[PDB]
Amino acid sequence: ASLTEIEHLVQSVCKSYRETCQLRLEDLLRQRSNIFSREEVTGYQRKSMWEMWERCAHHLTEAIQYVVEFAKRLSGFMELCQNDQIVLLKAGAMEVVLVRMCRAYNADNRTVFFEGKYGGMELFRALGCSELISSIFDFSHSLSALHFSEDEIALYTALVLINAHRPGLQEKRKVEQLQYNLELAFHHHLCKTHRQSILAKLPPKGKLRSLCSQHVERLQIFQHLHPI
Numbered sequence: 001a002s003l004t005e006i007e008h009l010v011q012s013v014c015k016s017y018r019e020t021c022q023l024r025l026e027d028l029l030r031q032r033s034n035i036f037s038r039e040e041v042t043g044y045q046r047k048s049m050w051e052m053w054e055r056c057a058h059h060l061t062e063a064i065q066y067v068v069e070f071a072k073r074l075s076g077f078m079e080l081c082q083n084d085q086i087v088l089l090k091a092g093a094m095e096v097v098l099v100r101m102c103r104a105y106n107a108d109n110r111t112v113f114f115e116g117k118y119g120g121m122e123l124f125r126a127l128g129c130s131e132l133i134s135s136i137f138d139f140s141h142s143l144s145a146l147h148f149s150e151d152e153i154a155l156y157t158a159l160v161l162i163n164a165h166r167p168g169l170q171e172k173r174k175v176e177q178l179q180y181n182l183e184l185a186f187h188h189h190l191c192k193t194h195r196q197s198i199l200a201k202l203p204p205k206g207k208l209r210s211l212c213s214q215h216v217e218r219l220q221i222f223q224h225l226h227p228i
């Protein structure tokens, strides 16, 4: 791949995420002053766990709805056998979602955008795992601190999916090629922006997995919804 092409490659990945941003960042920050009141909060605590995980998986699956449409318009993607085209899309998409929510994080008050307003980790007390909740908050913090940009998120998420180390792959020497040209397009654009400092500030390779993989286990008992 050449520079004029490595150019456009990066140029496209950022165009996708723009429309598939679920919520416009334009509106994400604008609604910062909209907060659930304590009754609205204690109201969200009244509910039984069964209700939340549904609401969760509802907006979640409605979100992953977008993610795929985003993930589809890439390059080299379609030209992968459907076995390997999916091993990724299945194992990858949650990790991607976890990332994509860092924008929803308002680090100024440690709150998150859930169905119309902003509220903290107490909005989800009823799920009985405050630790994992904060643990995710803590994760989203460590990116809100990196102050990820729209074009940064896109290019990093576009590398979460493309993992040729995911076992169960049969076009391995096909996947690798799409990884490299994405790894390269990533770094070589961080350089032209001089953001290379984050390449060590990046959340561990495995934390992103071991948090989403922990996100599904304590959901596997309540609902098993994997959208294709």
Ligand SMILES: COc1cc(O)c([C@@H](CC(=O)N2C[C@H](C)C[C@H](C)C2)c2ccc3c(c2)OCO3)c(OC)c1
Pocket: 022, 056, 057, 059, 060, 062, 063, 097, 098, 101, 102, 112, 113, 114, 115, 124, 127, 132, 133, 136, 137, 140
């Ligand atoms: C900050 O990281 C996350 C990760 C996520 O999975 C979610 C999920 C909800 C979820 O499963 N959780 C799991 C956790 C144990 C308790 C919390 C309710 C967040 C989500 C919700 C609404 C959405 C959405 C995505 O996209 C569109 O609207 C985040 O939203 C809060 C942030």
